[PDB]
Structure formats: C-alpha cells, structure tokens
Amino acid sequence: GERMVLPAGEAAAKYYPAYRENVPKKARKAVRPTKLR
RNA sequence: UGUUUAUAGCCCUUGUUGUAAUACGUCCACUGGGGACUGAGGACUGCGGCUUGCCAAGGAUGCUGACAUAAUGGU
C-alpha cells in the first residue's frame, strides 16, 4: 500500500482520507432468466 | 287377498374378469403454483455440487422509474 508498488508524480489516487472503506463481502447472487407466466 | 321371476326385481353363497378400482393409513433425499415478513454479516479462507472456472454451497443482490421534494422522518 506504499509508493514503490505504485510510483507516480501524482500518486495512483490523490488523497487517502478516512477509514479503510470496508469492501462489501463477495455476494452469492447470480442473475437468472425470469420464468414468465 | 293369495304365490316365488314370469310382462319388475331383491337377497344369500361361489367362480371368472381380478393381480380390479376407490377411499383411508403411510412414505417419496417426487413435483407444480399463490401470499407475507426478514436481508443480520461485510476482502479471502470452510463444507459441498458442477466442470480450471462456474454454482441457490459459511446471512441480497440485480435491473429500472418517480421525486429530488417537506417526499421519508422528527416534534
């Protein structure tokens, strides 16, 4: 998460405020075709 | 009024169709719908299924619209 991995003159992202921004858990819902009347 | 299938029939017993059907009881790791409430958790770990990726498998996501309002909510 340091700068050697992602070095730039502007950084990969300009600013890193606040908490870690918790990623949602990987859902297990898959879209399937609707069975119509 | 009286008799025993006749110009109606019924009952009892036995065979065949029959290994009949239906009801009831029971089970299916068989199946088709309709309605309601709930979405806690938050990278990855697991147990499974499928065929390495996928999956309804250790708790909801997806696609849209209206309003962006005093609408919802509070007093």
From Swiss-Prot:
In terms of superkingdom, the source organism counts as Eukaryota
Subcellular localization:
Cytoplasm; Nucleus; Nucleus, Nucleolus
**Family membership noted in the UniProt record:** Belongs to the eukaryotic ribosomal protein eL6 family.
Q: How does it assemble?
A: Component of the large ribosomal subunit (LSU). Mature yeast ribosomes consist of a small (40S) and a large (60S) subunit. The 40S small subunit contains 1 molecule of ribosomal RNA (18S rRNA) and at least 33 different proteins. The large 60S subunit contains 3 rRNA molecules (25S, 5.8S and 5S rRNA) and at least 46 different proteins.
Protein task:
Component of the ribosome, a large ribonucleoprotein complex responsible for the synthesis of proteins in the cell. The small ribosomal subunit (SSU) binds messenger RNAs (mRNAs) and translates the encoded message by selecting cognate aminoacyl-transfer RNA (tRNA) molecules. The large subunit (LSU) contains the ribosomal catalytic site termed the peptidyl transferase center (PTC), which catalyzes the formation of peptide bonds, thereby polymerizing the amino acids delivered by tRNAs into a polypeptide chain.
Name of the molecule in the record: Large ribosomal subunit protein eL6
Q: From which residue to which, out of the full length, is covered?
A: 13 to 49 of 195
